[PDB]
């Protein structure tokens, strides 16, 4: 029956890491290796699964995350990383097999549009009424920063600082964040996230053959 729809990936401006787009698939047939032949994969490292296996297994759900990402920040996009990307931008599950891919959009992939630059939330805290004490807001797994409400979808300058007033239910004070940037590259480089879940008598996201 039906085929898994990866099309959105190939058409638009992929968001920055902290605004990742997510496609969620059930009851479909996929050809992941076809998808990745459209790009220059620079890195493909999984956790509790393999590149070979993730292309050929049956799932209850396959979940795919995509965003613009500089290849020069490879060390921060890692299932073992403790940098700003897992702290404030993007964190995957530990209790499910996952994978992280680093690609480059080739010139003959012409429906993928570049943003001005790459930007990531380098700090997301919450300070108290004392305007000094800072309480980090670490991102949950599979979720966005609470501080994406105050960060522009693309940060104009390295170091820009954002602020918003909190009601007393949340402790008063401000929600505070700060952003860093990386110069856009000649070809758009991206990062992808894959997460699989296995079920009992309900594995319907299986490879096409």
């Amino acid at each position, epitope marked *: 029956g039906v085929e898994c729809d990866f099309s959105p990936l190939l058409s638009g401006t992929p968001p920055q890491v902290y605004n990742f787009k997510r496609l969620v698939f059930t009851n479909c047939n996929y050809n992941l290796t076809k998808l990745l032949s459209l790009f220059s994969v620079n890195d493909f490292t999984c956790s509790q699964i393999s590149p070979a296996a993730i292309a050929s297994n049956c799932y209850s759900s396959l979940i795919l995350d995509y965003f613009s990402y500089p290849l020069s920040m490879k060390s921060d996009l890692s299932v073992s990383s403790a940098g700003p990307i897992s702290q404030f931008n993007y964190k995957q599950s530990f209790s499910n097999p996952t994978c992280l891919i680093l690609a480059t959009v080739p010139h003959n992939l012409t429906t993928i549009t570049k943003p001005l630059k790459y930007s990531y939330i380098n700090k997301c805290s919450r300070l*108290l*009424s*004392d305007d000094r*004490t800072e*309480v980090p807001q670490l991102v*949950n*797994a*599979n*979720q*966005y920063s*609470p501080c994406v409400s105050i960060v522009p979808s693309t940060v104009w300058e390295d170091g820009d600082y954002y602020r918003k007033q909190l*009601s*007393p*239910l*949340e*402790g*008063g004070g401000w929600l505070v964040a700060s952003g860093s940037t990386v110069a856009m590259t000649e070809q758009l480089q991206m990062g992808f996230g894959i997460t699989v879940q296995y079920g009992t008598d309900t594995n319907s996201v299986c490879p096409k053959l």
Partner: antibody
Amino acid sequence: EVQLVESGGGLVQPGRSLRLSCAASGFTFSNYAMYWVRQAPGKGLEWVALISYDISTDYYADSVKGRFTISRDNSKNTIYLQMNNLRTEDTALYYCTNTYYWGQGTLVTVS
Amino acid sequence: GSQPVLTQSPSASGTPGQRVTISCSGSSSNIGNNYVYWYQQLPGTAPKLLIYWNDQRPSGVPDRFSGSKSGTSASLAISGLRSEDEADYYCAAWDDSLSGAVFGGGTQLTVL
């Protein structure tokens, strides 16, 4: 581990007085607003009072304005809810929270 | 208990595995400029935070729970509806008019 223990609850005649406590552990207390929520048996939760982490401002429900007082001590990681001229509508289970963790309540009965 | 500022239509039906939502409606002084929190309470137990800051999920809550906030109303959707989901579900938010927090009427879901 995060724990939140109330006390003080009990029996009082209408219009009497009753002081509640709530001790906390397992987090940085001086970072959270703390507040009291009550539940009359078989009914919904109703917000009672809130006090900031600086013994700042306090907030009250119109049901309890002028009678209740919320207090706070950061050296003991403790909260107080003073209740005066209590009434039959003050019968409830008294919960103490930040937002993430709740406590097993304490009983307030009056009739 | 004198009527809450929030309207929580309290009946919520479904079936195992179904998706039931809980609609919490209010006014522009509470939902609309303030964050929503969602709570779950089992028969005779303390409440538990499910969703905070309208969409956020504390680690420990199953992924089946998620929250959203449009302009004036907020809702808690549940996928893969289970049997431990038989509980009472409440929304809450700050109110700039009362300068106090507001809870909803409280919905009870029953599913089997």
